[PDB]
Amino acid sequence: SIKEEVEKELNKKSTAELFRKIKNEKISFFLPFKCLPAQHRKLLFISFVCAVLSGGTLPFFISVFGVILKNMNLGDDINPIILSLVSIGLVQFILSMISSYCMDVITSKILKTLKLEYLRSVFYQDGQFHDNNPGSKLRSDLDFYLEQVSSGIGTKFITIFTYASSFLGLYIWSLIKNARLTLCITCVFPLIYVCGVICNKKVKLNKKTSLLYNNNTMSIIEEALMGIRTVASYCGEKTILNKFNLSETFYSKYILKANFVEALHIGLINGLILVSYAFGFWYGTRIIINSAFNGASVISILLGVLISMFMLTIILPNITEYMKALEATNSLYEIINRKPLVENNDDGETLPNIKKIEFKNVRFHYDTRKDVEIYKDLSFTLKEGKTYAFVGESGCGKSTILKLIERLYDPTEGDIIVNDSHNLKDINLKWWRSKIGVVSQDPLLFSNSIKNNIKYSLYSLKDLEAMENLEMKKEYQTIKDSDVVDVSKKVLIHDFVSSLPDKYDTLVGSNASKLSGGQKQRISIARAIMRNPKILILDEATSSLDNKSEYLVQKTINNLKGNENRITIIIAHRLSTIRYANTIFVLSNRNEGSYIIEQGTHDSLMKNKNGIYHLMINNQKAPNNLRIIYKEIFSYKKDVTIIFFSILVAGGLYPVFALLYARYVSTLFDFANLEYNSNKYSIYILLIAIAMFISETLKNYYNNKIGEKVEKTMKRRLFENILYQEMSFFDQDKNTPGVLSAHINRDVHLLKTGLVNNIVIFSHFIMLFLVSMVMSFYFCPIVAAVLTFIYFINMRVFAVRARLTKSKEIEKKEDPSFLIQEAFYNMHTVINYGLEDYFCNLIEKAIDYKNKGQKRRIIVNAALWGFSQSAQLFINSFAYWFGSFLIKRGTILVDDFMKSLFTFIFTGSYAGKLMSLKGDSENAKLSFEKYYPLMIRKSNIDVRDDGGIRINKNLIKGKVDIKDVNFRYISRPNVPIYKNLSFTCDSKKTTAIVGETGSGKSTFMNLLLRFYDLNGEILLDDINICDYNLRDLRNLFSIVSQEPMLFNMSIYENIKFGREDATLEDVKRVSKFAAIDEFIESLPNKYDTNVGPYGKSLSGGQKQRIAIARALLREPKILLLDEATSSLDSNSEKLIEKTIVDIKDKADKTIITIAHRIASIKRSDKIVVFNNPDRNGTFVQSHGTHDELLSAQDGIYKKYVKLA
């Protein structure tokens, strides 16, 4: 979107801001490297030194460059120095390779470790944290941090040192060779950084004010799209567009000012370099002539200084990423360093046996709703060898009971006394959980096999066997299956499993999906049984069973072992499950705390008294698409020629600088008549600078100008088309507001930052390409041919970075992903049993597949990166050798070679610099193809059409006649609504309507304003509605909806909505007649106050009276009311009813109403009611009563006089 882009642009703090931000909080730079062995702590030194060496390369190359040129011009050999490059290049390659390996063996390790540590903390959550940050969010966080640290810690941390070393070569070498020259050169760049700083603020100050005018448009759009119906009826299509257009302009002008300043500064940058070169050569020559020191030594200075100040452009970004990654990890660290509150030691002193588990006034609140206490006087005791039972709903608080028995929530005052001399906190957690069997509402298991799902609890038991006195992987095979076998016959799951083969050898689906729900419950129950359940707890277990499965489970559990000493619980909705019970506790808070209310059994309370249980058992018992765009563009003429000119200049004049540099180099080695040449060339360089500045500036500025004008003219057509569309269009599902605003706010901005930004680049690149390939071959065909062959085959067959990024992205997408996803669903079941079974299993399933792909990826990619760094050296050397080999045998001179070379090189480099500013085009070429039909679609109801009968307000009758209707919504053309409707309203005569609620009453008004065209036969004054030229038809009705809708504009306009030709005095008189101008007169900005969006700064009564006065202004002939006083407070409702009766006293308008206030209905001179006896539709029962037929026959009016 647009807002996100600008927020990203503005919320981009510098390195100084980050430095001051990290200064106070004191993040350790040792933070990412903490879990390292000392092995890696030494290994890291290798890549450190293997970096600094490779960055001490270029100073040598530069200190031999000038001597190559001197040795070449005046006829001598160059062979030794060539070797003194090539060997050096080789060592660079080696070092580069090595460094890669080191990173891709460090990072992964210190990555992987932290993963498990994070994961560990998730399995020591103290219950409440499962509610705080539940599940998937954490995965939406975790992986994010990985991509924020696996892309800011690798090679991009070390390269800077190389560059630093390179800096720390060049300048100081240039400093020892000479002093004054490089100072007089470098004096200028501070004046560049100054301009950059000064221009950034002038960008931002306009950028924000551009946003102050945007969001207003968004509000205008959405606020209008919700209020489509009132806008349609009241004819405010035009006034909105004025607001929209008046808002666009401020935005456009500000953003264009910003773009202008930006292009200006960029041009200045492309200008100053040339003045730098010129003054450099001039001053150097002058001090040579004053000397009587070589000239070649000058050449090696300049480039070096320049390239030095290139490195500062490219160092700084990488740093930020590292720092970014750094703070990211800090977050995760304080997540591992949390302090859960129910953490274990497996060391709490446990007892021999269980007796006297007592409770006293459980007082506990939810963590969020601290001001909502849950239980008040819950107290009881649970002695060994006793059964119990409970009944309730699924939100009363039994979840907290289960969490208390399980030690997940720790109540404040309620005690957990057990055995009368020990606390559950003194007692071990895991010994407590070892002897517990629970089966929740839904069964929850894992996806390996049935027997191993069962043996998980057994593993949890063997843990206690081996811990208090790595055997775990061995003893688990000691556990057998026959227990599961002879208990599987008891739960009657032998036929389903015997049917298909592979009884338990089969692997069951995700969360054991292949079983039925009841069968998964059978297996969960068998698990609970096999784990020595000292207590069995069901949590709405039978809430989703048919009768047979529940009864079989009941027979299974009622006579189950350990009945001498256990606490069996059976919770459910139906009560027959507790037809037998030794004790039943029931509670309620009948609103700040519950407590036990009743006790008893089934028979001794079903027919004993009229308590709660008795009441419950008694009651319940393509081409042209874009050619359109190109047409709209080339209609512009003044701003196409100028971009064309500046393109030609900036393209076909930069290569000239290459040969100009060459012609200076040659004459720099001829001591005679050297001054005149120096002048004659330096001046030309100045002129080139002057031209390039202007050309680039105007290029960028008019580019942005054109894009802006296109967007402005585009949104207008789209919005002005979509506004007038019909209503059934909006009735569709996929015709949503949000999608449409998204189109308007995204696709067009892509259309600017897409097409027009990409076409210019292609034009400029192609121009430079053609001029160079036409220029070089004229001087030296052989060299240019071979060079083009080399770069072609290199970049299109040995494309190193492309293949590298392919490897990175195809690897970044990535079965531990299956297990890790499976875990966070069955969090409950791992808390039931098994914490470190998977802590170690995931490590294995990761490392088994890590290394084999790791070796191939690293051994392939490190060499690619190494060769990527050490190519241009070899190319330049090969070029010089081939050149001299031709020169000495005398086939081509030196100057043609020099010229062709420099042209080719500088143009290639600059085109590489320039291509990295493109934008997205495919998505923009696709969006247009998507939303083009909407800005052309035919509405089928257009007010703009003026072909029909004209009507004048002076001669309106107000008679209506209807015969029959069978209407069917488009949401469901399967069940009709209206059937055989017919009635009348003669003239200035009330007609009150009352029907069954939801009987389609408030759809009839849609038929009148043609919101839904059409079986059905209307007659207004004995002509059908469809030939009245509806432009006028919506200027004499008026509506008072169930809810009004106020717009962000002030009162004076909303009340003037529709009719601008409305003086303030009309507003005053119609307000006093509306009985409203008493609160408004007593406030500043009387007819000027700005309400909020949707009038959220207002009441209901004032809103309604305003909505009514907005209708009264037109003096509409046929008023249409519908239920305007539903649920208002006393005084406003009173004033409103007063105004209604005041209006209805005057029989000057044919009023229609829908109300249920019999005191006002009786005055109605007509009654017509709509019944819906059976679900077929609606039709009339009574007619022509008008209070003369009070209760004479069976109907609904008799009801609405006695019922109502």
Ligand SMILES: O[C@H](c1cc(C(F)(F)F)nc2c(C(F)(F)F)cccc12)[C@@H]1CCCCN1
């Ligand atoms: O063309 C220049 C360039 C320089 C140098 C350096 F001077 F460091 F050896 N190496 C470049 C490389 C290289 F592969 F690192 F050699 C590729 C492309 C451009 C390079 C860059 C790219 C934009 C124009 C000025 N800096």
